[PDB]
């Protein structure tokens, strides 16, 4: 059991992350990455998620930062070599974190390069109201602003808002469609309640014809 | 233009039905059936819907009844020869109406046979909460009761109720899932409203650095 225990450690670490015990998430990821590396090899497609989560938690630990870069770039390669949309989106995510490492490294022109890389990938596969696109636009405007490109920084912040505003539009439509569906489901339920008496009459109508009926009725017909 | 005008006449008649001008729906159907018969032949698969709607409106007109039978049985054949679920369900519907013609004809053992035929078909392809199954069970219990089989009549009426009750169960779940989805869509909308100020700060943060910034800032970096 190796693929068995490796997924467990991914869960362990992911929720040590969401809880914020990061040395304990790094630990979970470092061993998952070690169980897969020693079963499939440390460039194998089976190691891509494990390495990306490992480098994600290495980036957070530096908040070493150089080990985050190795692990995220390895993940990008593993991810980009496969032509699945799931994998291409994970490649985008590895670019997003590689850009986050650049910003920690005060290397702002590369963050722009990695954030743009994430965005070009994500816009091929995601709808114009995906918060992930609001995140890349915002992270891109951060990089541009840190790099002191203030006009392109504003442009990216406004793109972020434009995505966030588009999603409030879609969500309000889905409210009206949910609450409207709810309205019709409720109306049909009452329509069906009012059918059950009329059918119960037909049942009792029949039970009386059988009580009053003798056995010869059917066989003389 | 023949397939062009034939669909129009199906619409015309269908809504002369839903309005209740039945001689005007029969007229629409008789000509659609004549446009398809003289283009594809009067056993062709292209004539199945047109003949079924025609015989459906002939049955209602008798409320002649013999012409309803011809047209519905032709439709059943056209429908059953094709292995599509849409066509098999239409075959079931032709059986339902052929059974309705039997009841008008005081021929109750055949109604049982045709209603059962509808049901065996519909239970292969429909979910246990489809009102169409409540209709067949009810129409079947009518036939059984008219034929003076009172115990099987009750059985079919109770099956009808059992279907109707199952659908009230499914509809209440869909209410809770709609109104619950609505609840979460509303919560995320407010979460997104509270993001737009923080991003607008980042924009104004940047616009001030550009106002205060001169042109040499970027090119000396």
């Amino acid at each position: 059991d190796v693929d068995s225990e490796a997924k467990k450690l991914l869960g362990l670490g992911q929720k040590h992350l969401v809880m914020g015990d990061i040395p304990a998430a790094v630990n979970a990821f470092q061993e998952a990455a070690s169980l897969l590396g020693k079963k499939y090899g440390e460039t194998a497609n089976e190691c891509g998620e494990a390495f990306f989560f490992y480098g994600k938690s290495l980036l957070e630990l530096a908040r070493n930062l150089e080990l985050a870069w190795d692990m995220l770039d390895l993940a990008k390669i593993i991810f980009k070599r496969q032509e699945t949309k799931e994998a291409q989106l994970y490649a985008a995510q590895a670019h997003l974190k590689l850009g986050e490492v650049s910003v920690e490294s005060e290397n702002y022109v590369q963050a722009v390069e990695e954030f743009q890389s994430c965005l070009n990938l994500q816009e091929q596969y995601l709808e114009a109201h995906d918060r992930l696109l609001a995140e890349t636009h915002y992270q891109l405007g951060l990089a541009y602003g840190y790099n002191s490109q203030y006009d392109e920084a504003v442009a990216q912040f406004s793109k972020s808002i434009e995505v966030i505003e588009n999603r409030m539009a879609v969500l309000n439509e889905q409210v009206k469609e949910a609450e409207g569906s709810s309205a019709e489901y409720k109306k049909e339920i009452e329509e069906l309640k009012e059918l059950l008496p009329e059918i119960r009459e037909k049942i009792e109508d029949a039970k009386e014809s059988q009580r009053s009926g003798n056995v010869a009725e059917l066989a003389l017909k | 233009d023949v397939d062009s005008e034939a669909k129009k006449l199906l619409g015309l008649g269908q809504k002369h039905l839903v309005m209740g001008d039945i001689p005007a729906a029969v007229n629409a159907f008789q000509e659609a059936a004549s446009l398809l018969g003289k283009k594809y032949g009067e056993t062709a698969n292209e004539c199945g819907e047109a003949f079924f709607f025609y015989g459906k409106s002939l049955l209602e007109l008798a409320r002649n009844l013999e012409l309803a039978w011809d047209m519905l049985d032709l439709a059943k054949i056209i429908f059953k020869r094709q292995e599509t679920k849409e066509a098999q369900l239409y075959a079931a519907q032709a059986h339902l109406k052929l059974g309705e013609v039997s009841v008008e004809s005081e021929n109750y053992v055949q109604a049982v046979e045709e209603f059962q035929s509808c049901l065996n078909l519909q239970e292969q392809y429909l979910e246990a909460h489809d009102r169409l199954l409540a209709e067949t069970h009810y129409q079947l219990g009518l036939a059984y009761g008219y034929n003076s089989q009172y115990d099987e009549a009750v059985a079919q009426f109770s099956k009808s109720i059992e279907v109707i009750e199952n659908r009230m169960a499914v509809l209440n779940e869909q209410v809770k899932e709609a109104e619950g989805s609505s609840a979460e869509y509303k919560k995320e909308i407010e979460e997104l409203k509270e993001l737009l100020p923080e991003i607008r700060e980042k924009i104004e943060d940047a616009k001030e650095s550009q106002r205060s910034g001169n042109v040499a800032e970027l090119a000396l970096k």
């Binding site: 995140e135 | 979460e191 991003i199």
Partner: peptide, 14 residues
């Protein structure tokens, strides 16, 4: 300085 990265984890729902 690092409130910027918290706003990002808020723009994405995680």
């Amino acid at each position: 300085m690092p409130k910027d990265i918290q706003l990002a984890r808020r723009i994405r729902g995680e």
